Design a protein around this nucleic acid. Structure first.
Lengths: 121, 121
RNA sequence: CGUACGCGGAAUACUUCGA
RNA sequence: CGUACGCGGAAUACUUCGA
């Protein structure tokens, strides 16, 4: 059981729920997918999002600079390792990548990209 | 001679200039690298940037939604193609990717990521 | 700054198979 | 929504070679 950088559990819909949603509505999916990779390990999350202020606040809390650093530090070594944050929403994907030594900046760019991605008209 | 999505020419420093800059100063490079890829074709640019308002204004003009769409449309076909914008600055890289059908949104996210990247403390 | 290459990881696009 | 795979492209990290 590795330590995840996420503070909220995964919310992936079952194949059935996904199908039901499809027949009900795309630019209106159940949510978005985001991931954090440290070296050879990747952690993923699908989170429900409905474009409301309440929902945006909730999902922006899925990870923080501190939770990412704590999870990432477990994989640090003599040499620098590759770190990456990815988020996909409505057909568009943004990936922020860099070496572990720039993790702080990586997280700053990651959270900003996340907010902009979710607040896309 | 293919049509580039860029409106400013490349400014890659020679090996000599780069070396001279190194001995003079990293979080203070001569500039940043950005690229636009449409299908199997990629266009690249290294642009000088000194963190000033004047410089930021200048480099944000290297491409627009219109110049990207005109360059990208040359590669459109029956099926959708993969499009990508990448920018690297001070050890951090941001890549915005998606299918050609989302190019408009891709460009919106790309320009925002570019501005945030260049205005990183 | 740039060139060629290898490994790992990742992203996107198209296609297909499986629930 | 998810799984496995192939091709192309791309990104990052480490290493090395070449200017």
């Amino acid at each position: 059981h590795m330590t995840s950088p996420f503070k909220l559990p995964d919310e992936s819909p079952s194949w059935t729920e996904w199908r039901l949603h499809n027949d009900e509505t795309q630019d209106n999916p159940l949510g978005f997918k985001e991931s954090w990779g440290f070296g050879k390990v990747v952690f993923k999350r699908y989170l429900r999002y409905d474009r409301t202020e309440a929902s945006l606040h909730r999902v922006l809390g899925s990870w923080t600079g501190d939770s990412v650093n704590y999870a990432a530090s477990r994989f640090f070594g003599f040499d620098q390792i590759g770190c990456t944050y990815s988020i996909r929403f409505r057909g568009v994907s943004i990936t922020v990548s860099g070496g572990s030594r720039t993790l702080q900046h990586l997280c700053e760019m990651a959270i900003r990209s996340k907010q902009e991605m979710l607040q896309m008209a």
